Amino acid sequence: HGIRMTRISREMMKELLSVYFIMGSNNTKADPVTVVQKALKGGATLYQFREKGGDALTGEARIKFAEKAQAACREAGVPFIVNDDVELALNLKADGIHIGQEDANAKEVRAAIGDMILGVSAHTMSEVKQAEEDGADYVGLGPIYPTETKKDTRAVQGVSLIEAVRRQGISIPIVGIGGITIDNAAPVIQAGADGVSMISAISQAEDPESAARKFREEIQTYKTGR
Ligand SMILES: Cc1ncc(C[n+]2csc(CCOP(=O)(O)O)c2C)c(N)n1
Ligand SMILES: [Mg+2]
């Protein structure tokens, strides 16, 4: 994953979304970079650096943590995505950026980042369509199941929006998010998603490596079987 000179293809985008681990320092009681390393070794296919709120790091300390997480992703051969912070993404030469409905407007972010990967969180059909017309490479849909990791979430929607987007014939890359565990991931893939994303199911696991590996095995099975 080098410096891109073309938009990512939908085929490659959908492969990367399979097991999409998201983490910051306030999401684990263990050493944060160690947790990221273990998730990548077990099989996460994409990583998002999300360091915000709670007792998150700030300043130089947050930047130095991001550089260590990015180096972990380079050693594993997995792309590094930054949540929210367009300037950090550009300064680190991240592989991409994830934004939501209250963040910078997708059209302006797509202008600022060239051919980097762009993800948008969406909760409704118009928001998916808008994200696609704005130049997103994928959408994050949810919350599928109840979750407390992110404070301010929208209402729990199950797989309803995923099915509705596939019914309207839209083929954009989709990752499901919100309260996903190894026990409830399969239906997200059966409804038509290209992957699952998680924080707690991996970051707070007794054994994050084995948790990542089990997700990778299960998601592969269900993508072939739907
Ligand atoms: C790919 C992507 N889609 C959406 C979001 C926003 N988001 C929605 S629910 C949630 C918490 C999940 O934690 P848990 O797995 O512990 O329930 C997050 C961070 C994002 N940052 N990235
Ligand atoms: Mg955001």
Element (H, E) at 209: helix 208-224
> Does residue 19 contact residue 212 with C-beta atoms inside 8 Å?
yes
Strand 96-99 to 138-141 pairing: unpaired
What does the H/E/C string look like for 89-114?
A: HHHHCCCEEEECCCCCCHHHHHHHHC
Cα(110) to centroid(ligand 1), Å: 21
Q: Which residues contact 69 (CB under 8 A, 6 or more apart)?
A: 32, 33, 36, 47, 49, 80
- Integer angstrom CA distances of residue 132 from 12, 99, 150, 174: 17, 13, 24, 11
- Integer angstrom CA distances of residue 209 from 22, 143, 205: 14, 24, 9
List of domains in the chain: 1-226 (3.20.20.70)
Instruction: Report which of 149, 136, 127, 129 is spatially closest to residue 197, judged by C-alpha positions.
Output: 149
Phi, psi at 195, each rounded to 5°:
180, 180
Give CA–CA dist 175/188, Å, rounded. 9
Ligand 1 neighbour 121 (Cβ under 6 A): yes
Give CA–CA dist 47/193, Å, rounded. 18
Please choose from 17, 22, 174 the residue to mutate so as to test ligand 1's pocket, defined by most ligand atoms within 8 A of CB: 22
Resolution limit in angstroms?
1.2
Give CA–CA dist 114/6, Å, rounded. 9
Ligand 1 neighbour 123 (Cβ under 6 A): no
Instruction: Report which of 55, 195, 221 is spatially closest to residue 119, judged by C-alpha positions.
Output: 195
Ligand 1 neighbour 141 (Cβ under 6 A): no
CA angle 152/84/64 to nearest 5° reads 115
